Every structure is written in structure tokens, then in C-alpha cells.
Design a binder for this molecule. Sequence first.
Ligand SMILES: *[C@@H]1O[C@H](CO)[C@@H](O)[C@H](O)[C@H]1NC(C)=O
Ligand SMILES: *[C@@H]1O[C@H](CO)[C@@H](O)[C@H](O)[C@H]1NC(C)=O
Ligand SMILES: *[C@@H]1O[C@H](CO)[C@@H](O)[C@H](O)[C@H]1NC(C)=O
Ligand SMILES: *[C@H]1O[C@H](CO)[C@@H](O)[C@H](O)[C@H]1NC(C)=O
Ligand SMILES: [Ca+2]
Length: 382
Amino acid sequence: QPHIIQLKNETTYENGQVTLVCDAEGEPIPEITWKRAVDGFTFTEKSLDGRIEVKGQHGSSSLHIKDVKLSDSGRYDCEAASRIGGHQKSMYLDIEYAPKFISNQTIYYSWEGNPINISCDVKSNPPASIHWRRDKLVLPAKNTTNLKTYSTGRKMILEIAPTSDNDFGRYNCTATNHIGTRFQEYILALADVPSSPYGVKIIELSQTTAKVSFNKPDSHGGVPIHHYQVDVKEVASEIWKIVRSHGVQTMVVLNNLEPNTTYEIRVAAVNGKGQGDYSKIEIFQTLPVREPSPPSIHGQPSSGKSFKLSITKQDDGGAPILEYIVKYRSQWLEKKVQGNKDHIILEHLQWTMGYEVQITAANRLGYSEPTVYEFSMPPKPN
Ligand SMILES: *[C@@H]1O[C@H](CO)[C@@H](O)[C@H](O)[C@H]1NC(C)=O
Ligand SMILES: *[C@@H]1O[C@H](CO)[C@@H](O)[C@H](O)[C@H]1NC(C)=O
Ligand SMILES: *[C@@H]1O[C@H](CO)[C@@H](O)[C@H](O)[C@H]1NC(C)=O
Ligand SMILES: *[C@H]1O[C@H](CO)[C@@H](O)[C@H](O)[C@H]1NC(C)=O
Ligand SMILES: [Ca+2]
């Protein structure tokens, strides 16, 4: 009746090799099978890659792996089976290795007076002891009052309060366990302000507004652009006014400009360190105040032999409409009404007749092009 007497936990190192051994008693002499817990593969007296092979020694088995991978770790099951019965137990293969660094970022940017934390992240088995250093000097040392290190469990942090072109440069994070010492080099670099935005264009223009469009700088200086600043100045003025973009949009709308006015502008990106270089100056001129746009009208019958035109407010042109001029025929007749007006009543018409009408709007600048409108009077009532 098979009974396993020895099946010990094993430890080995990555890329090394290991031997798992199951010892079992019993009459008749027990047969022995290995199963790998993870994928449930079974082994007895292969395999493909040829890394793993099993050899038996009458009442005892051994499973040998060469070139151990981290995926070899975990539980392995030994079953000793015969005609009369079976016994099964389990063991664990632990795999050790020199520390590995899994930090996704090794270059960091800051500037004088701006505190920054650099993080070192390490997987290792057994757990490593970890230190930050510069040329074999562990940090902070007593003579580096601007440095501090923290451990959070899964990270080792070096906090730098930069205050000298000496706080910038390379730092080593070094980790060691009994397999060995490994290290990862980090860089703290001096951030800069952004370079010039370019390809600046006025891509929309009106009387009192304009939208400026541009390309982002080829250099953000090492820390992300936060927003953009557009300076805008009347050529005839000495005072620049400031417009901050909405976030990182490469387009800014200028509001409240004066009509028919020549403006100069320039754009600069701002990052955490400060304001970047200005683009080349760009010039544009806002549209002029003009005459009103052509009026828009429609009508309905108004008793008795009259008709009422209603005004659907239209583009002012920058100066108040103070006068509508309705001329109608079907030779012509004129008629004027005031800007604040809502409608116009034409009177003394004939039944069943059709009329030709032209409407003009006027402001301090002049008259619009006339709007043509025609209508048919209804038949006579009884
Ligand atoms: C084998 O390792 C496991 C951890 O996976 C632990 O229970 C102990 O160290 C060993 N178990 C037995 C039963 O030997
Ligand atoms: C750096 O990390 C430590 C530990 O979490 C934290 O207390 C400290 O405020 C951080 N410093 C900076 C510059 O963010
Ligand atoms: C980090 O360690 C390596 C190996 O000792 C060394 O070449 C390099 O100069 C070190 N960097 C720092 C900042 O000490
Ligand atoms: C501390 O910093 C100074 C300045 O570079 C350096 O010369 C000195 O070696 C450091 N002191 C030690 C070894 O702890
Ligand atoms: Ca620069």
C-alpha cells in the first residue's frame, strides 16, 4: 500500500537548475507520477524544450529542470500509485533571483526651488535592501540636508529639493539580496520653459473677434505645457493685453476687439517652470462697420384693402438701424418707417392684385442693398 515518505520543498535560482525528489514505500513497489499544478502537465519516465526530464529509481522518482524560468515556481504533485492503492502529496518550488527594477520612468525634470520625488521600484526574492547613492555614497548623507529617502513598501523614494546645478544629474538606486547587487541609474534634469509656438494664423475674423491658430512648440522644456498666452496690441497702442487659452488647445478666440483696427499678436506657451519664448509677431485687421444687411420680410392680409409686412430682424452692421425704406408698385411709391419698428402697413390697394416690394435698412453708414418681396392680395369679401 503505497505511502510517500519524502517530498521536500525546493529552492533554486533563475537560470539555474533543480531536482525534485519523491520517495515512496509499498509492496508491490509503487509507480510514481509528477503533475505540474499550474497547467496540470504530467510527467513520468520528454519534454519538448528538453529543459525538464524525469528519471525513476525503483520506489523513488526525480524530476530535473535545467535553465529554470520564473514560471517553474509553484506547486508540484507527486502520486505514488499501484495495483492496490495510491498516495499523493505536494511540494513547492521557490525560485530566487537578483533584484529587478520595474520603474517605468528614469529621467525626471525639475528646477531650483521645486521639490521632486523620484521613485525606485524593485521586485526581488528574497526581498532586497535598497539604497539611493552617488558614487558609493548613500543618500542622504549628513552633508546633504536637501535630500530625504522614504520607503512605502513597494517603492523607494528619493526626495530632492533642488538648489544648485549640483542637485541635478545622475543618481543610482541599488538593491542587493543574497543572489547579488543590481542597480538602476536615474537622471534629474533641469527643466526649461517651452520654445516658440509657430505657424501662427488668423483663421477666423469679424468686426470684434478673431480666432488665432498655431502649432505647439517642438520643445516643452521637460515638463508639460499648461496653457498658452496670446499678447494682442493695437499697432497704434503701446499696451499689450493678455488672453490665456483654455488648456492645451492650439486655438484661442480674441474677443472685444475694435472694428477696422490693425492688431499685432504673439503667442507663448506656459509650463510649470514658466512662460516660454514668443512666436513671431503676426498682424491682422478686424472688419469695418458697414451698412445693414438686406432686410427680411413676410406678410399677411390687413383689412381692408391693405397688407402688413413684418420685419424679421437682420444683421445690423455695427451701427443702429434707424430707418426702413419700403417701396412698392403693381411706377413705384416710397415709404419710410423707423428702426425700432416691428412692421409696416401698406394701404389703399386693389383686391385680387399682386404687388412688387423693395425694402432697405439704413444706419449712420448708409443703406443696405434692397430686399425684393412680392405678394398677392386676396379676392373681394362679401
Ligand atoms: C512548503 O512550502 C509551503 C509554502 O508554499 C509552506 O507551507 C511550507 O514551507 C512547506 N509546506 C510543507 C507542507 O512542507
Ligand atoms: C515624496 O514622497 C513622500 C512619501 O510619500 C511624501 O511624504 C512627500 O510629500 C513627497 N514629496 C513630494 C515632493 O511630492
Ligand atoms: C551607478 O553605478 C554604476 C556601477 O557602479 C556606476 O558606473 C555609475 O557611475 C553609478 N552612478 C552613480 C550616480 O553613482
Ligand atoms: C558630502 O558632500 C561633499 C560635497 O561634494 C563631498 O565632498 C563629501 O565626500 C561628502 N561627505 C561624505 C563622504 O559623507
Ligand atoms: Ca530654451
